[PDB]
Amino acid sequence: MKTPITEAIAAADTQGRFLSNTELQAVDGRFKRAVASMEAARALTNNAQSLIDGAAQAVYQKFPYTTTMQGSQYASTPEGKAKCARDIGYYLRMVTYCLVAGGTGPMDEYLIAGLSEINSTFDLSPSWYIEALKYIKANHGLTGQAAVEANAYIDYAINALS
Amino acid sequence: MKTPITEAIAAADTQGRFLSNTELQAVDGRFKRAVASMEAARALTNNAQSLIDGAAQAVYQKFPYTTTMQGSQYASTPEGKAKCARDIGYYLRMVTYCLVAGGTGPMDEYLIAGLSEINSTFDLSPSWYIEALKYIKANHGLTGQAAVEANAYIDYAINALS
Amino acid sequence: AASRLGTSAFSDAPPVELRANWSEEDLETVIRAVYRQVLGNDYVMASERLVSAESLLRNGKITVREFVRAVAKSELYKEKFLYGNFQTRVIELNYKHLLGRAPYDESEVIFHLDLYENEGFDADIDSYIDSPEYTNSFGDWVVPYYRGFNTQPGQKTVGFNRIFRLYRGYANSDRAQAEGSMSRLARDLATNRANTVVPPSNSDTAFAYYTPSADVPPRACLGGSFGESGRVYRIEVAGIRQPGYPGVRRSSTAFLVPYEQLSAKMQQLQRTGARIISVNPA
Amino acid sequence: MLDAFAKVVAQADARGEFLTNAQFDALSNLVKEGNKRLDAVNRITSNASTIVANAARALFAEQPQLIQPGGNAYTNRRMAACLRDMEIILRYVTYAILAGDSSVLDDRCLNGLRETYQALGTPGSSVAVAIQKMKDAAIAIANDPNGITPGDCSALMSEIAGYFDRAAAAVA
Amino acid sequence: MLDAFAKVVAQADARGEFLTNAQFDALSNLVKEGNKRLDAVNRITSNASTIVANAARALFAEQPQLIQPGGNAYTNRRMAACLRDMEIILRYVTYAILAGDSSVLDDRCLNGLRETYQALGTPGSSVAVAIQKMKDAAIAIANDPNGITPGDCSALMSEIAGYFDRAAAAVA
Amino acid sequence: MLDAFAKVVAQADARGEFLTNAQFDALSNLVKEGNKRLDAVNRITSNASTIVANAARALFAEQPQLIQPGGNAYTNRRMAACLRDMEIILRYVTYAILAGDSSVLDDRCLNGLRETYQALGTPGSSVAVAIQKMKDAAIAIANDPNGITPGDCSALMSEIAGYFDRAAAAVA
Amino acid sequence: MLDAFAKVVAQADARGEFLTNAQFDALSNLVKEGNKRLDAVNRITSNASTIVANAARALFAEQPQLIQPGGNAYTNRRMAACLRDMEIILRYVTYAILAGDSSVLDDRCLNGLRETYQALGTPGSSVAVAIQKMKDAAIAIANDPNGITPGDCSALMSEIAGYFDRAAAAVA
Amino acid sequence: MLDAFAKVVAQADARGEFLTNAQFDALSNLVKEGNKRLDAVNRITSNASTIVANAARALFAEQPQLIQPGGNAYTNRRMAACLRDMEIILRYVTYAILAGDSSVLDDRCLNGLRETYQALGTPGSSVAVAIQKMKDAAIAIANDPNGITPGDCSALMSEIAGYFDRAAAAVA
Ligand SMILES: CCC1=C(C)/C(=C/C2=NC(=C\c3[nH]c(/C=C4\NC(=O)[C@H](C)[C@H]4CC)c(C)c3CCC(=O)O)/C(CCC(=O)O)=C2C)NC1=O
Ligand SMILES: CCC1=C(C)/C(=C/C2=NC(=C\c3[nH]c(/C=C4\NC(=O)[C@H](C)[C@H]4CC)c(C)c3CCC(=O)O)/C(CCC(=O)O)=C2C)NC1=O
Ligand SMILES: CCC1=C(C)/C(=C/C2=NC(=C\c3[nH]c(/C=C4\NC(=O)[C@H](C)[C@H]4CC)c(C)c3CCC(=O)O)/C(CCC(=O)O)=C2C)NC1=O
Ligand SMILES: CCC1=C(C)/C(=C/C2=NC(=C\c3[nH]c(/C=C4\NC(=O)[C@H](C)[C@H]4CC)c(C)c3CCC(=O)O)/C(CCC(=O)O)=C2C)NC1=O
Ligand SMILES: CCC1=C(C)/C(=C/C2=NC(=C\c3[nH]c(/C=C4\NC(=O)[C@H](C)[C@H]4CC)c(C)c3CCC(=O)O)/C(CCC(=O)O)=C2C)NC1=O
Ligand SMILES: CCC1=C(C)/C(=C/C2=NC(=C\c3[nH]c(/C=C4\NC(=O)[C@H](C)[C@H]4CC)c(C)c3CCC(=O)O)/C(CCC(=O)O)=C2C)NC1=O
Ligand SMILES: CCC1=C(C)/C(=C/C2=NC(=C\c3[nH]c(/C=C4\NC(=O)[C@H](C)[C@H]4CC)c(C)c3CCC(=O)O)/C(CCC(=O)O)=C2C)NC1=O
Ligand SMILES: CCC1=C(C)/C(=C/C2=NC(=C\c3[nH]c(/C=C4\NC(=O)[C@H](C)[C@H]4CC)c(C)c3CCC(=O)O)/C(CCC(=O)O)=C2C)NC1=O
Ligand SMILES: CCC1=C(C)/C(=C/C2=NC(=C\c3[nH]c(/C=C4\NC(=O)[C@H](C)[C@H]4CC)c(C)c3CCC(=O)O)/C(CCC(=O)O)=C2C)NC1=O
Ligand SMILES: CCC1=C(C)/C(=C/C2=NC(=C\c3[nH]c(/C=C4\NC(=O)[C@H](C)[C@H]4CC)c(C)c3CCC(=O)O)/C(CCC(=O)O)=C2C)NC1=O
Ligand SMILES: CCC1=C(C)/C(=C/C2=NC(=C\c3[nH]c(/C=C4\NC(=O)[C@H](C)[C@H]4CC)c(C)c3CCC(=O)O)/C(CCC(=O)O)=C2C)NC1=O
Ligand SMILES: CCC1=C(C)/C(=C/C2=NC(=C\c3[nH]c(/C=C4\NC(=O)[C@H](C)[C@H]4CC)c(C)c3CCC(=O)O)/C(CCC(=O)O)=C2C)NC1=O
């Protein structure tokens, strides 16, 4: 994954040289920031259930047609709304992963790289996952540096979907 | 050069992408440690002459045969003693350049590259410079993280000679 | 006509594929030749050679194609050419070092540049390496050579002209050339303009003839010229130094001269010391 | 590719004398305002796409001859190339801002751009106008007095403007 | 050649629309600071000889290869030629400063100058270094705050630097 | 690459005809003095490293500005390149001696060297001085009268001088 | 300058043989229909001004972009140049009609025309349209059956059409 | 162009060292062999007409295609030009012989000549053959021992042959 530590390791590997003080400084910076990132991730996962359900309702309200229009892509049937909730949960799990990984690596490997193709084939309108992520961005309940870093990742996802 | 700032720029340039948060964090770390790096550079250059002279005497003591054996590679003549002083001065000047550049860039560009070739053709055994660098590492009289950075670059040179 | 043009002897192909792929000695030769072609005859110091690649190279885990790509994408190559030159100039250098030719038309720059802009440089080198041309002329077991001199593949005539702009001699390296640090085949490539062949220096005076058409007479006479019997011969010259009234101005330039006057003009030019590059009918 | 620190080091190496106290102080001043430089590049990179898009729509509104048939930014392929060459300039200017030195901008983008454009026949003056549009957009976005700890950053803004101006003058 | 006024008129004529109010305001701003342009040109031209002499001594001290036997700036004839061409570049740059546009500089001095030096065999890199020496000397003399009515002439000084940079990048 | 025999054959091929008796006698003279040629090339090749090293020390003692900071034989990378180039000139001259013709010397080694050094900035005259140092050293080593069966060798020594001279003049 | 007679002589001189009876017969046919040739030249030259003027009006009516601001036949100086070049082509075609061969047309007004127009920016396709307009007008005025003695002139008409077409093909 | 003395002086000036004793003795040898040089040039110039005429007769006998119709010496104008060029080569070679160096031979002759014949269409290989015929004629006329004070002149004859060969090979 595209972790800062891992990226430095790969940069040194391509040149075949032992890790110089530049890479060590970079990883030290990541360790110094990791305290805030990990506290934020713990908070988000302890409160995950509320956020996932609220986001599902948020998209059902902003786009009522999506829960009343026939089609497999729509959540009118109970199975469809369950799948919508499951996908929102995937997004939240990825945001916690990228919080603890100190970069956008996890998001890019398990999302982003591929989202366009799948959103076209399975008729998954990006707008749905834009509005849900905005709800999460507003109800995350974090404060301080945790709030800014988590919102940075969530907006990365928003700007990648659209 | 292989300067932290320049390295980040090159990493973004090879992939044709705008500067990502990872590289910006790395450069921020560089700026945060620059205060100590510049302090160390100041300290080394303020005692430069004493360090050069002491290192010269150190190698004369460790390898007495270099002050007696006849030959151009040896410092038995006064001209050779001047050459020895000049080259130890080169090494110390390069260490200060590396201290201010925050990376091994200057060392690799103005030294190391082809160090083996020159030391073989002019019959200048690397061990001489290795001992001199050890003396510099022990007498520069630094403390703290400034000391660790300076010692790291000196040892980079030592291992490169070996 | 070999010595003057510069192709001293480029008359064979060095493969490494063998039962003894190492061949105990031949592999040393192959490694040297790859360094000479990929890095543009740059003098690589012993410490900065790409030892990791050579390890796999003798082991047989990687083929010559993989070795060439490894050098091309390694920072050794990037510091010399990729980072430090205009991007189009870098495209020209890639064509010279990996495919042993010069850009035949502007579409080449379009395609490679777009790769660089979106996919990244690594993908650009990938495209050169696995293009049909590299796969055919070379074979994952054959060091790239300058096949631009030979015309067998199928190419625009201009290609010959253009390759002689990039190759300025056996000794020359693209890190160190007369017109270096700026695009060598960019203004011409957009206009599909031919280039006069500038012979590399050989134990006689050299005067690299830049040919910006910004201020030169047209290739053709575009008229009757003086109107004397016979056509109009275009004479180029580079080293005009003796008659500097404000400073001569435009030391390298061409003059369209009617046939009857050529002799006179010639001696005048020789008096200034410029060695006539070419005399082409217009 | 040399940043400010590397530029001073290389010049000092050409002379061959240890960095003097004055040079040390200068570099320390550069580091003292480094956080501002980092924030500026961060903000500009986050809005890069919008910067180039708004500047493009303005350029084609003020110079319609470009998008009229037979003009240089017509046929939708050349339009793509035009947007590409605006974002390229923005990217290399961002590199220059982070470095603190214009060497990258002058060596890998501006070095020969004018010749390429005039050989193409595409108007260099119009390219400069586009650069200026991007200049005002980026300078407004980066200096936006909202969201972060307030301070005096006029010097850094002047430097950013200097980079943009250098590009505009070098292309036209 | 086109000066600033002529450049705006020529662009407006090419598009075929009466000069718009924005262009008028721009030209009024230019004339409002015209006295500053005139003062700068006067100050640089009255110190031409000292500028070129100081820059030359510095160049030959920093790059001794030029004055070594067998180098390019040797034999006392080529030394005279080198000084003459350095002052020629300074002269066309002063013309450009007074004009407000680089058209004259790009049409007479640096126009096809790269080819000239490349054929002659002179190092163009060294010429660029010499132009840079002249740049710092001239900008210091022109921006000298003592001797005249105080004010901020920094924009014009940056423009002068831009002209010098354009020449230095076009020769090397 | 043409050797002596090949040179005569190529001229004869240009003119068609058939090898004349004079040409036969010339080649016979070449072969009857061949042992001398081989001995000379063996002696020069056996002491190649010391020839290059001694000449290099002399060059840097005579022209110290090359190895002073900021000169072209500085920074330990360019020093390696300079030693490399000296050895390469010696190697191609040795090739020429064995061949008996200077075609190899001008076809690969001197083919383009002049512009290479002109662009690098390396003083060509100093390189010529270095080649001349090597010329004296190598010719003395080959003309050493002790160690081998004595006999006339002055013609071959003059030929060696001629090769070194050709290289030195072409670089300068 | 080679007319029909000169062309026959030149080919015969290349072979080194006296003109064959067939060549004599061809030139005799040329002279026996010479009055037609010179009559056509006279009619074309008598209406030259009207031919060029009417064709110019038609070209600018068919392709208004040329005379719109910015177009290459705008600002009244380039308009004069355009009319001049149209009449130049007419003049060289008239020369070719009198001579009987296209040598003059291909040597003195068609040789480098394409490259010059390409560099200028002049649209070559538009120039071809213009010359074809002139072609129809001149053909009609020369072929008018009223006003002169009746006869057959079709071969000469085809020849003049061929020369106009040659010019159109070279410029575009 | 230079002469032998001037050539040595110029090289030594480029390197920047007073003329060494080795160079002095070389030049003294040249002057001790001076009267021979002057005699040779006097005899060649006095028989210039006969040299060129005999060589021309031989060339056209050995290569009949030149004077046949359609060949490059045909038409009696090109024949005059060919004789002129052969005499021109002889004239510049005589200049060179007196000078003692091939500087004049490369500075005002042979430079551009090679491409001149390729452009005109004249075969350069035939020109080379003609120069060789002239070489034989001139060498014989200079080396005739009868009519002049006897002595050794083989070295001078070899030098003359070298000049002739240089021209003949480099023109083809
Ligand atoms: C970890 C990253 C990841 C993502 C992003 C992902 C997306 C994803 N969403 C899917 C389907 C789906 N997604 C929805 C979601 C919605 N229905 C609505 O009404 C809403 C407006 C919307 C939520 C915002 C529905 C109903 C399906 C089922 C459609 C089907 O089976 O055809 C499917 C097809 C398989 C399935 O039925 O679940 C995939 C692969 N899968 C992944 O592994
Ligand atoms: C700035 C980077 C840089 C370095 C490092 C450098 C090293 C360097 N040191 C050299 C020589 C030398 N180095 C020494 C050094 C010593 N002699 C002794 O007895 C001691 C044990 C020892 C001190 C540790 C001597 C005596 C010479 C002179 C060589 C000679 O006369 O042959 C030479 C040979 C040519 C010359 O004299 O310059 C080089 C290139 N050059 C460079 O440009
Ligand atoms: C992923 C990084 C990497 C590894 C690990 C690697 C291993 C590696 N080691 C090799 C050689 C070798 N390695 C050894 C090593 C040893 N000899 C001993 O006596 C010891 C017990 C041992 C060292 C502790 C030897 C002797 C050879 C030479 C084999 C030969 O050429 O005959 C070779 C053969 C080809 C070559 O030399 O390039 C490979 C591929 N190559 C790589 O790129
Ligand atoms: C150093 C990095 C770099 C730059 C800058 C660069 C410039 C560059 N821009 C190009 C195209 C272009 N560039 C423009 C640019 C513009 N047109 C306008 O109307 C505007 C005024 C302006 C944008 C604001 C246009 C119209 C083309 C297409 C030209 C054509 O197809 O004829 C081309 C032609 C080849 C192609 O389209 O692929 C090059 C080489 N190339 C490079 O490698
Ligand atoms: C096989 C025939 C052949 C030759 C001769 C040749 C010359 C040659 N010499 C070079 C460099 C060089 N050449 C020198 C030479 C010298 N500097 C001095 O002070 C001395 C006076 C002089 C030695 C006598 C130096 C210092 C460089 C390195 C410059 C650099 O890379 O920055 C370079 C390019 C830069 C590099 O090394 O990457 C080439 C191509 N190339 C060839 O293929
Ligand atoms: C009005 C515009 C204009 C320009 C720009 C110009 C340049 C110019 N400078 C020249 C000469 C020269 N220029 C230089 C310049 C330099 N020598 C060095 O060592 C330095 C590296 C560099 C200055 C820093 C030299 C040495 C010559 C003489 C070259 C020779 O005689 O071989 C020449 C050759 C002919 C002559 O000397 O008259 C031209 C054409 N002439 C012009 O009319
Ligand atoms: C990963 C790179 C990075 C970022 C994003 C970052 C953010 C960052 N911005 C800051 C403040 C600041 N930001 C500014 C910037 C401005 N002043 C203005 O008037 C303008 C509107 C604007 C220019 C963009 C200033 C002056 C400060 C406070 C002092 C400083 O640290 O520079 C501070 C210090 C005070 C605080 O904690 O709020 C941080 C840590 N730090 C970093 O290392
Ligand atoms: C022969 C043509 C001509 C000249 C040369 C001229 C000079 C001139 N410059 C002036 C002002 C001035 N001169 C400056 C100049 C400067 N301020 C700075 O900080 C810099 C160091 C420097 C510019 C680089 C300023 C700021 C003013 C006042 C505002 C202005 O009029 O431009 C004034 C008016 C105030 C005064 O001095 O009485 C005059 C008359 N007037 C003329 O008709
Ligand atoms: C490996 C291939 C090979 C080589 C290289 C070779 C060389 C070779 N050259 C020879 C002759 C010679 N060696 C010399 C040597 C000299 N006399 C002098 O006064 C000078 C100081 C010096 C010139 C460098 C001469 C003049 C001859 C010719 C006479 C003869 O052939 O015996 C001889 C016989 C006597 C001797 O050793 O000199 C050998 C073996 N033979 C071979 O099969
Ligand atoms: C001032 C110089 C000069 C002129 C102009 C001139 C004209 C001239 N044209 C003639 C014939 C002629 N002209 C034509 C012409 C034509 N037939 C056609 O169908 C076309 C409409 C037209 C082509 C334009 C024909 C058919 C003849 C008679 C046959 C001939 O002699 O060519 C004749 C002989 C019969 C006659 O009196 O009409 C003269 C004298 N003679 C001169 O000395
Ligand atoms: C002072 C230095 C100098 C030289 C050398 C020189 C040569 C020279 N010879 C020429 C012509 C010519 N040269 C020849 C020569 C030859 N025809 C043959 O069959 C032979 C193979 C060959 C003689 C050996 C011919 C035939 C022409 C005329 C070409 C033409 O009119 O088309 C021309 C073309 C212009 C002209 O007619 O003069 C030049 C420039 N001019 C000079 O100023
Ligand atoms: C006005 C100009 C001028 C001329 C021309 C001149 C000729 C001249 N040629 C001379 C000798 C000579 N001339 C020759 C000439 C030759 N020997 C040969 O075997 C060849 C066939 C031929 C030359 C290729 C030789 C060998 C000598 C005596 C040695 C010498 O010149 O040094 C001498 C000295 C003895 C004598 O009078 O013969 C003079 C004065 N003196 C002059 O002042």
d(C-alpha C265, C-alpha B95), whole Å: 61
H or E segment and range at residue C256: strand C253-258
**What approach was used to elucidate this structure?**
cryo-EM
d(C-alpha F59, C-alpha F56), whole Å: 5
Name the residue in chain G with its Cα closest to that of E16: G69
d(C-alpha C198, C-alpha C186), whole Å: 17
DSSP strand pairing (C279-281 vs C232-237): antiparallel
Whether residue H144 lies within 8 A of chain C, CB to CB, comes out as no
Question: Using an 8 Å Cβ cutoff, are C273 and C241 in contact?
Answer: yes
| Residue of minimum CA distance from atom 8 in ligand 9 | F35
Give, as one character, the DSSP assignment of residue C252: S
Question: b/e for A129-154, b at 16 or more Cβ within 10 A?
Answer: bbbbbbbbbeebebeeebeebbbebb
d(C-alpha C114, C-alpha C112), whole Å: 5
Q: What are phi and psi of C142, to 5 degrees?
A: -135, 120
In the reported structure, the alpha carbon of residue D81 is separated from the centroid of ligand 4 by a whole-number distance in angstroms of 5
Question: Using an 8 Å Cβ cutoff, are H48 and H87 in contact?
Answer: yes
Q: Which one of H2, H15, H21, H101 would you mutate to disrupt binding with F, by most F Cβ within 10 Å of its Cβ?
A: H15
Q: Nearest-CA neighbor of C74 among C97, C48, C93?
A: C48
Any contact of D with B, at least 3 CB pairs below 8 A? yes
F111-F115-F121 Cα angle (round to 5): 135
Which residue carries 């718009």 as its tokens? E20
Instruction: At D152, list the tokens.
Output: 């005096």
Measured between beta carbons, the chain B residues lying within 8 angstroms of A20 are 103-104, 152, 156
- The backbone region for E57, taken as left when phi is positive above 0, alpha when psi lies in -120 to 50, beta otherwise, is alpha
Question: Using an 8 Å Cβ cutoff, are G121 and G71 in contact?
Answer: no
Which atom of ligand 4 is nearest to C88's Cα?
Answer: 43
Q: Nearest-CA neighbor of D40 among D136, D134, D159?
A: D159
Distance of CA A33 to the CA centre of its chain: 19
Whether residue E11 lies within 8 A of chain F, CB to CB, comes out as no
Question: Using an 8 Å Cβ cutoff, are F94 and F88 in contact?
Answer: no
Asked if C75's CB is within 8 angstroms of A16's CB, the reply is no
d(C-alpha C34, C-alpha C138), whole Å: 12
Instruction: At E101, list the tokens.
Output: 């546009």
DSSP strand pairing (C232-237 vs C253-258): antiparallel
Residue type, H93: V
Q: Which domains occur in chain B, in start order?
A: 1-162 (1.10.490.20)
Question: Using an 8 Å Cβ cutoff, are A102 and A34 in contact?
Answer: yes
Q: What are phi and psi of B111, to 5 degrees?
A: -150, -175
Q: How far is CA E85 from CA C210, E54, E61, E91, E113, in A?
A: 20, 15, 18, 10, 11
d(C-alpha G160, C-alpha G140), whole Å: 11
Residue type, C53: A
At C30 the three-state DSSP class reads helix
In Å, how far is C276's CA from the nearest CA of chain E? 12
Instruction: At E141, list the tokens.
Output: 């003399």
Q: Nearest-CA neighbor of E132 among D159, D155, D11?
A: D11
d(C-alpha C216, C-alpha C214), whole Å: 6
Alpha helices in chain C (DSSP H): 26-38, 51-59, 64-73, 75-77, 87-98, 106-118, 121-130, 132-137, 158-166, 187-191, 262-272
Instruction: At C106, list the tokens.
Output: 């502007």
Which atom of ligand 12 is nearest to H42's Cα?
Answer: 5
Q: Nearest-CA neighbor of G93 among G155, G165, G29, G4?
A: G165
Give the neighbours of chain H: at least 3 Cβ pairs within 8 Å.
Answer: C, E, F, G
> With a 6 A CB cut-off, is D103 part of the ligand 4 pocket?
no
Dihedral sign, Cα of residue H142, residue H145, residue H150, residue H152: positive
At C15 the three-state DSSP class reads strand
The count of other CB atoms within 10 Å of the CB of residue D106 is 19
In the reported structure, the alpha carbon of residue A111 is separated from the centroid of ligand 1 by a whole-number distance in angstroms of 13
Question: Using an 8 Å Cβ cutoff, are C13 and B82 in contact?
Answer: no
Q: Nearest-CA neighbor of G52 among G135, G172, G154, G117?
A: G135
Question: Using an 8 Å Cβ cutoff, are G72 and G123 in contact?
Answer: yes
Question: Using an 8 Å Cβ cutoff, are F110 and F167 in contact?
Answer: yes
At C282 the three-state DSSP class reads coil
In Å, how far is E117's CA from the nearest CA of chain F? 11
What strands lie across the sheet with C253-258, from one edge to the other? C253-258, C232-237, C279-281
Q: Strand pairing partners for C235?
A: C255, C279
Asked if F129's CB is within 8 angstroms of H15's CB, the reply is yes
Q: Nearest-CA neighbor of H51 among H166, H172, H164?
A: H164
Query: Which residues, other chains included, contact D69 with Cβ-Cβ below 8 Å and sequence gap of 6+?
Result: none
Provide the residue count of chain C: 282
Whether residue F124 lies within 8 A of chain E, CB to CB, comes out as yes
Give, as one character, the DSSP assignment of residue C142: B
Whether residue E68 lies within 8 A of chain H, CB to CB, comes out as yes
Ligand nearest to the CA of H156: 12
Q: Half-sphere exposure of residue D84, counting CA atoms within 13 Å on the CB side? A: 15
In Å, how far is C135's CA from the nearest CA of chain A? 25
H or E segment and range at residue C202: none
d(C-alpha A25, C-alpha D46), whole Å: 25
Name the residue in chain A with its Cα closest to that of C70: A14
> G145 burial class (0-12, 13-18, 19+ CB within 10 angstroms)?
exposed
R_g of chain E computed on alpha carbons: 18
Asked if B34's CB is within 8 angstroms of D95's CB, the reply is no
Q: Which domains occur in chain D, in start order?
A: 1-172 (1.10.490.20)
Asked if G119's CB is within 8 angstroms of C222's CB, the reply is no
d(C-alpha C198, C-alpha G65), whole Å: 42
Distance of CA G155 to the CA centre of its chain: 15
Question: b/e for E133-170, b at 16 or more Cβ within 10 A?
Answer: bbbebbbebbeeeeeeeeeebeebbbbbbbbbbbbbbb
Instruction: At H98, list the tokens.
Output: 């007196």
Q: How far is CA C244 from CA C241, E57, E72, G54, in A?
A: 6, 24, 17, 52
d(C-alpha A9, C-alpha G122), whole Å: 58
Instruction: At H102, list the tokens.
Output: 């091939």
Q: Nearest-CA neighbor of A127 among A78, A80, A65, A71?
A: A65
| Residue of minimum CA distance from atom 26 in ligand 1 | A80
Question: Using an 8 Å Cβ cutoff, are C36 and C144 in contact?
Answer: no
